[PDB]
Amino acid sequence: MDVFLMIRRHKTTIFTDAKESSTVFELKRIVEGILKRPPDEQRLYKDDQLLDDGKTLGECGFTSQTARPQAPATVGLAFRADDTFEALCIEPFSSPPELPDVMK
Amino acid sequence: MMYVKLISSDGHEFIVKREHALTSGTIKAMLSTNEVNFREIPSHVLSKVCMYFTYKVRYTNSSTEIPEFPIAPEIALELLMAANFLDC
Amino acid sequence: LSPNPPKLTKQMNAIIDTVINYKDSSGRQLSEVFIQLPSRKELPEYYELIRKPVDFKKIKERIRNHKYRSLGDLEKDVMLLCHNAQTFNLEGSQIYEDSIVLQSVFKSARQKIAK
Amino acid sequence: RPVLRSVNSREPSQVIFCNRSPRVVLPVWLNFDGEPQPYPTLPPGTGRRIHSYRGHLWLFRDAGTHDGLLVNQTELFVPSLNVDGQPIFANITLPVYTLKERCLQVVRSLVKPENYRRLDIVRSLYEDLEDHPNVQKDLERLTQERIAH
Ligand SMILES: Cc1ncsc1-c1ccc(CNC(=O)[C@@H]2C[C@@H](O)CN2C(=O)[C@@H](NC(=O)C2(F)CC2)C(C)(C)C)c(OCCc2ccc(CN3CCN(c4cc(-c5ccccc5O)nnc4N)CC3)cc2)c1
């Protein structure tokens, strides 16, 4: 029933949870509470694909098998600036060092 | 619904529910204010820490069988140091 | 002190080897656990409850040394072993069930060897 | 006779051991002197109907590392008498480990005990890595908790 997500934009990551039954619009409403941008200033994505407001999270492909507490599914986020949405841009996390010789 | 922001050494911002961040004894102490900067914890480690917070809250005292918390060998040492510093 | 006739010793051994070698439908040798008793140091609770302890090792030794004077004497020690295993472990245990199959195996081998 | 041990009840009890963890499970039986006895292991996702007795005490560990496991959401399992035949269920699972303990498990699984002090980490963590999961330590911890209550 529950889906666990990372809503990412540039250097920002929101860790949140929702139901498989909740809509993409309800998710935009969670973001609005946190980042103070209304849903109409938001574009949500799954693997560079635009998510429709009326669709449930389950219908988008976010399930208890793909969106886990220990391994959350990533949702992309693009904001609207001067009536134009920016290109979807997600900054990668830092890279770990090369595995030590004793760990091989 | 209270949220807190956790900033990594490389400037990534992680927004987690307050109750989930209180899993860490160090964070709980620093919030005893809803923003904490970690000048020595990189984003690839901090994101993994936030995933532990979700895992812990969801599975502590659950009746649904508990999955393993997975850790890649390449992040194991830095993740150990952060868990030790964060008291979680 | 005088030994048993060789025919009687041969009969006693042929029966006991049929009991010891017996395997169920799954290929499991049922006598396995009953070959040797655990020691008093290992399982003192067995010795607290079981007055006349015996295993298939002490049984084979008793044939070899002519302690059993008839097939009936051999039977009393095999039934004793199984009843000891039943009393200690109680109903619902696999060892209890295995000891009941071995009782039946002994009596059928003794009937076959004496025909 | 210690606090944590089995009672020689001689009262039969049918139990189902069910490994619902991703680990190979070591069932551990505490004898009549409270000494731990290793029992045949259970591969992940397997169940066996076993015979035990009323008032007998069980613990469950990872067979290879001896990391502690849960049984019906607790540490110790004691079967009571079966009510009208009914076997008693023992559902074995992973606990929620601390992030530190889980990190220690992973680093111990990759590095040999001799090379722990060759790791580029906070020096306090060497003693943490050396302090391996131990059944006896946990039994002392559980006994101390029992006397406290
Ligand atoms: C499959 C599987 N997968 C995962 S776990 C598992 C599994 C689970 C259960 C068992 C068998 N059950 C038990 O051992 C239960 C459990 C606990 O309550 C204690 N206990 C008992 O029987 C004790 N009994 C008692 O408290 C009482 F009987 C007094 C009531 C005890 C230990 C015998 C004192 C098993 O078994 C297979 C593995 C397993 C377990 C234990 C042992 C060591 N044995 C101990 C003594 N034993 C015996 C020999 C003879 C005997 C010998 C010669 C001649 C005549 C005889 O009657 N008689 N009875 C014995 N129990 C041989 C070696 C070996 C193998 C495997």
Domain boundaries, chain A: 1-104
> In this structure, what token pair is assigned to residue A68?
């886990």
Q: Sign of torsion, CA D30 D31 D37 D42?
A: negative
Pocket of ligand 1 from Cβ distances under 6 Å: C 33-34, 37-38, 43, 45, 55, 81, 84-85, 88-89, 95; D 10, 17, 27, 29, 39-40, 42, 48, 50-53, 56
Listed resolution, Å: 2.3
DSSP string, chain B: --EEEEE-TT--EEEEEHHHHTTSHHHHHHT---EEE-TT--HHHHHHHHHHHHHHHHHTT-SSPPPP----TTTHHHHHHHHHHHT-
**D-chain residue closest to C96, CA distance:** D51
Kindly determine whether residue B66 and residue D102, on different chains, have CB atoms separated by under 8 Å: no
Q: Which residues of C are documented as binding site for Zn(2+)?
A: 66, 83
Range of the domain at D71: 4-93
Ligand 1 atom with least separation from CA of C81: 55
**Residue B88 sits at the chain D interface (C-beta within 8 Å):** yes
**What is the distance between the alpha carbons of residues C78 and C10, in angstroms, rounded to a whole number?**
17
DSSP 3-state of D60: strand
Q: How far is B43 from chain A (nearest CA, A)?
A: 5
Residues 6+ positions from B23 with CB-CB distance below 8 Å: B52, B53, B56, B57, B88
**D-chain residue closest to B79, CA distance:** D103
Q: How far is C45 from chain D (nearest CA, A)?
A: 8
How many structural domains does chain D have?
A: 2
The angle that helices B76-86 and B43-59 make with each other, rounded to 10 degrees, is 60
**What is the distance between the alpha carbons of residues B31 and B26, in angstroms, rounded to a whole number?**
9
D53-92 residues touching B, CB cutoff 8 A: 73
What is the residue whose two structure tokens read 């944590």? D4
**Residue D139 sits at the chain B interface (C-beta within 8 Å):** no
**What is the distance between the alpha carbons of residues D88 and D79, in angstroms, rounded to a whole number?**
7
Ligand 1 atom with least separation from CA of D10: 30
Q: How far, in Å, is the centroid of ligand 1 from the Cα of D77? A: 18
Q: Is residue A26 within 8 Å of A56, Cβ to Cβ?
A: no
Domain check: are D66 and D104 in the same one? no
Domain check: are D10 and D67 in the same one? yes
**D-chain residue closest to A102, CA distance:** D111
What is the residue whose two structure tokens read 């001799």? D114
**What is the distance between the alpha carbons of residues D80 and D77, in angstroms, rounded to a whole number?**
10
> In this structure, what token pair is assigned to residue B21?
């961040």
Kindly determine whether residue B60 and residue D96, on different chains, have CB atoms separated by under 8 Å: yes
**What is the distance between the alpha carbons of residues B77 and D107, in angstroms, rounded to a whole number?**
7
> Determination technique for this PDB entry?
X-ray
**What is the distance between the alpha carbons of residues D71 and C78, in angstroms, rounded to a whole number?**
41
Ligand 1 atom with least separation from CA of C99: 57
- Asked which of D58, D77, D93 is the last residue of a domain, the reply is D93
Domain check: are D89 and D104 in the same one? no
| Mutate: best of D97, D103, D128, D129, partner B, most B CBs <10 A | D103
A73: β partners: A5
Kindly determine whether residue D98 and residue B83, on different chains, have CB atoms separated by under 8 Å: yes
**Residue C42 sits at the chain D interface (C-beta within 8 Å):** no
**D-chain residue closest to C46, CA distance:** D8
End-to-end CA distance of chain B: 22
Kindly determine whether residue B81 and residue D122, on different chains, have CB atoms separated by under 8 Å: yes
**What is the distance between the alpha carbons of residues C83 and C89, in angstroms, rounded to a whole number?**
10
CATH T-level fold of C1-115 = Histone Acetyltransferase; Chain A (1.20.920)
D74: β partners: D71
Give the domain CATH number at D131. Answer: 1.10.750.10
**Residue A96 sits at the chain D interface (C-beta within 8 Å):** no
Domain check: are D80 and D124 in the same one? no
> In this structure, what token pair is assigned to residue A3?
């889906």
**What is the distance between the alpha carbons of residues D23 and D64, in angstroms, rounded to a whole number?**
9
D-chain residues within 8 Å CB-CB of C94?
51
Domain check: are D79 and D25 in the same one? yes
| Mutate: best of C47, C86, C93, partner D, most D CBs <10 A | C93
At least 3 CB pairs under 8 A between chains A and C: no
> In this structure, what token pair is assigned to residue D48?
């066996």
From the list A69, A21, A74, the residue with the least C-alpha distance to A46 is A74
Domain check: are D15 and D76 in the same one? yes
- Distances from the Cα of B69 to the Cαs of B18, B35, D50, D101, D128, in angstroms? 21, 26, 30, 11, 19
What D42-45 contacts at long range (C-beta under 8 Å, 24+ apart), as own/partner pairs, is: D42/D17, D42/D92, D43/D19, D44/D19, D45/D19, D45/D20
Instruction: Output phi, psi for D13, to 5 deg.
Output: -150, 120
Domain check: are D127 and D86 in the same one? no
Kindly determine whether residue B88 and residue D99, on different chains, have CB atoms separated by under 8 Å: yes
The angle that helices D99-110 and B43-59 make with each other, rounded to 10 degrees, is 120
CATH architecture of A1-104: Roll (3.10)
Residues 6+ positions from A59 with CB-CB distance below 8 Å: none
End-to-end CA distance of chain A: 40
From the list D126, B42, D2, B69, the residue with the least C-alpha distance to A69 is B69
Domain B1-88's class? Answer: alpha beta
| Mutate: best of D65, D96, D99, partner B, most B CBs <10 A | D99
Pocket test for ligand 1, best of D39, D53, D88 (most atoms within 8 A of CB): D39
Kindly determine whether residue B80 and residue D104, on different chains, have CB atoms separated by under 8 Å: yes
